Design a protein around this ligand. Sequence first.
Ligand SMILES: CCNC(=O)c1cc2c(-c3cc(S(C)(=O)=O)ccc3Oc3ccc(F)cc3F)cn(C)c(=O)c2[nH]1
Length: 107
Amino acid sequence: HMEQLKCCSGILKEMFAKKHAAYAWPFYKPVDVEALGLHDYCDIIKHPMDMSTIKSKLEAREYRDAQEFGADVRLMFSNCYKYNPPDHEVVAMARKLQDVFEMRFAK
Ligand SMILES: CCNC(=O)c1cc2c(-c3cc(S(C)(=O)=O)ccc3Oc3ccc(F)cc3F)cn(C)c(=O)c2[nH]1
């Protein structure tokens, strides 16, 4: 349970790595709804999630185990698949970052 969270820090560190930056950047920080003019985001997405928030919750020991950490990572991608049209570029970027996550998470 607790032994798994040090692997979670390594996964998140890998997701913030420069080799993933071309597709990972939209997930580093919360969606800036004001800068993008997305007035309905908070009405559709009840639980916003991004990599910086997950890092804060992980350092605050808010995840009991890897499953709790993985649920927030998957909430981040699901928020993206739910809010956006399926053909939007951010959805293709979310799929590439999710492959990086799923690979390290399974291993
Ligand atoms: C159809 C309505 N949807 C959106 O406009 C929308 C935007 C985002 C962003 C996002 C956030 C920022 S920021 C750092 O300024 O907060 C800047 C750019 C962003 O996305 C892109 C915008 C245009 C592109 F062509 C390619 C993008 F990647 C992140 N995520 C997780 C989303 O789900 C999302 N949806």
